[PDB]
Structure 1
């Protein structure tokens, strides 16, 4: 029970307001870990991508020619540290950062367009909450983009979004101005193709494939009887006995027990570039893993993360039982987190980042 591996992933145990890491949950046992990505670095990368685009642009990106680069921001999960730090990244990059990641918290910024200085204004930063309470709702993004165009019109010079889902949702707007620069995050399949079409201007890969392998590989190492650095290194930062290794670069953060993949920008200049050859068939005995997903209709998890898991799982001889919640209530997941005695290891993607206790309670 409490002696088995527990790997949190994609939603780090943490306080949804202050973002401080929940080390109580992380210190569940000596076989507990988190797998994710360097979210803060990812945030600055999204910002840098936007600054580089503006820098290479002519003064035509200033549509109304008022000398101000106006933008609208799609805020996602305000209880998710990885999401908010993207709002922080782009705001810092553009000079609109005031210390808060909340909607309506922005000052006048500054950026270079065609070797000239420009004022920057966040016309509106809004949380795209669905009428059913669902966060980062894509239909709400379409709705908001429609109103924004009607309200601000020629003032909007670009669109920014915490993820691809909402960004691709903006593009659904019937009145979306042809060619309006817009940026997302995740490098979902549809988003990358959109970059190739010259619609979506750019997005960011968080190396989801590296993350998926890392979850399985850590469990693999632990069930093979590894301890210490071997657990977080073998098949991850160095080759294991089988010879397998995650190709993308990965860091281990000891203080928070986290394996973090890095990020890379995706633009018109490199979209064609976007499975791991460094992972091939394992001979180790098969093991049973119960893996949860906080929301079955989550675009990133449904379209990118889960397929990755189901691809690499048999290669590492991990028989994966997948259960999925609704994104609203932790009970939608916790209800399916049962028969824990019939499993060798566990992977948890929580609805709320502060719900660590509820999962470790069941494992007693």
Structure 2
């Protein structure tokens, strides 16, 4: 009657992982036979490694691990393997070799490349519809880009493929600046503030961000410089960001489906905790032990299908 599942979130105050954490908790409360043991790893992998030892000591039947460091997947797998405990890794993708080293290791995530392509499609759509955004009238987008953590799968794929998609759409681009703000609102506000105080400031046409939290910090810096007409694009469709698309402060974002990634992680973890096949009685398509949940483009034209206009 007491199926214990251990869950580690790499950082509880990452805005998107906060939506994922609350949706997994919602699913756990709704299943009468489950007890979720939730942990905040506080963005430190040593803290997470010790939390996994305490969870195994408490006799959890499955682990749902959102890694701090993707390279620590091996360390986690060996802790789990000794007790025959299945591990459903989520959000930060481990290596293929790491996933292949243990029959009971699974992954729930997304195809990183896809959100980059979708963001580039949105920017392309809106660029063509608002020729007044081309401030210097040269037919090229002069942009700045706010990147997430360097090395991170989603940060590298969204930076590469948003520009790639724009160029493939026949829109030439010129990068005025790019720097990491580590997925953080405050750090993004400061970097955008620096750029608006630098020599490139009058040349900026579009602000591209790897997530909505950083986009929200850029919107604040633009407000302060009375540059609120510069379009900002993000990724995740956070409720607060959807409010800005609704108000026109952001020009578009890409839904990162937190509720279905949460549901897939919970479903796979509970099945595997019960000795059943990972996808039993579900509609999740597992391919090579991986579930990928689609991104969806969001702007003012389909915004009612995600929030109230």
What is the TM-score normalised by the length of structure 2?
0.67
Q: Matches of 2:254 and 2:239 in 1, distance apart?
A: 12
1:45 equivalent to 2:118? Answer yes
Does residue 1:27 correspond to 2:61, yes or no? no
Once residues 272 and 255 of structure 2 are traced to their aligned partners in structure 1, the CA distance between those partners, rounded to angstroms, is: 28
Equivalent positions of 1:51-200 (< 5 A) are 51-58=124-131, 60-95=132-167, 111=171, 119-128=172-181, 135-150=182-197, 151-173=199-221, 174-200=224-250
The DSSP-based 3-state class of the residue aligned with 1:252 is: coil
On the 8 A contact 2:117/2:162 being kept in 1, the answer is yes
Shift of 1:222: 1.5
TM-score under structure 1 length normalisation: 0.57
Q: Any conservation in 1 of the 2:219–2:228 contact (CA below 8 Å)?
A: no
Q: Report if aligned partners of 2:123, 2:233 keep a CA contact under 8 Å in 1.
A: yes
1:201 Cα deviation after fit: 0.7
* Structure 2 unaligned residues grouped into runs of 5+: 1-79
Contact 1:232/1:259 (<8 A) preserved: no
Q: Does the C-alpha gap of structure 1 residues 163 and 176 become closer, same or farther in structure 2, counting only changes over 3 Å?
A: farther
Displacement of 1:176 in angstroms is 5.0
Q: Is 1:261 paired with 2:308?
A: no
Aligned-partner SS, 1:253: coil
CA distance in 2, matches of 1:126, 1:186: 19
CA contact (8 A) 2:148 2:180 kept: yes
Q: Establish whether residue 12 from structure 1 lines up as the match of residue 62 from structure 2.
A: no
1:277 alignment partner in structure 2: none
Q: CA 1:34–1:189 in structure 2 vs 1: closer, same or farther (change >3 Å)? A: same
Matched, 1:272 2:300: no
Deviation at 1:137, TM superposition (A): 3.1
Distance 1:169 1:236 in 2: 38
**Which deviates more from structure 2 when the two are superposed, residues 180-189 or residues 215-224?**
215-224
CA distance in 1, matches of 2:134, 2:116: 24
Partner of residue 354, structure 1: none
Q: Within 1, Cα distance between the matches of 2:109 and 2:190? A: 31
- Name the counterpart of 1:209: 259
Please say if residues 143 and 204 of structure 2, whose CA atoms lie closer than 8 Å, have aligned partners that are also in contact: yes
TM superposition shift of 1:272: 2.5
Query: Structure 1 pair 82/68, CA: closer, same or farther in 2 (3 Å)?
Result: closer
Q: Partners of 2:258 and 2:283 in 1: how far apart?
A: 14
2-side partners of 1:67 and 1:46: how far apart? 19
Aligned mates of 2:241, 2:135 — CA distance in 1: 25
Q: Matched residue of 1:92: which SS?
A: helix
Structure with higher helix content: 2
Task: Kindly state the Cα deviation for residue 138 of structure 1 after the two structures are TM-superposed.
Answer: 2.3
> Does the 8 A contact of 2:211 with 2:234 survive in 1?
yes
Offset at 1:145? 1.2
8 Å Cα contact 1:252/1:259 also seen in 2: yes
Unaligned runs of 5+ in 1: 14-20, 97-108, 112-118, 129-134, 238-250, 275-364
C-alpha deviations, 1:19-64, integer Å up to 9, x for none?
Answer: xx242x2134322101111211222111111111112222x11123
CA distance in 2, matches of 1:201, 1:233: 41
Contact 2:121 2:166 in 1 (8 A): no
Q: 1:110 to 1:123 in 2, by over 3 A?
A: farther
CA–CA separation in structure 2 for the residues paired with 1:148 and 1:6? 43
Q: 3-state DSSP class of the match of 1:268?
A: coil
Deviation at 1:94, TM superposition (A): 2.6
Does the 8 Å CA contact 1:110/1:120 hold for their aligned counterparts?
no
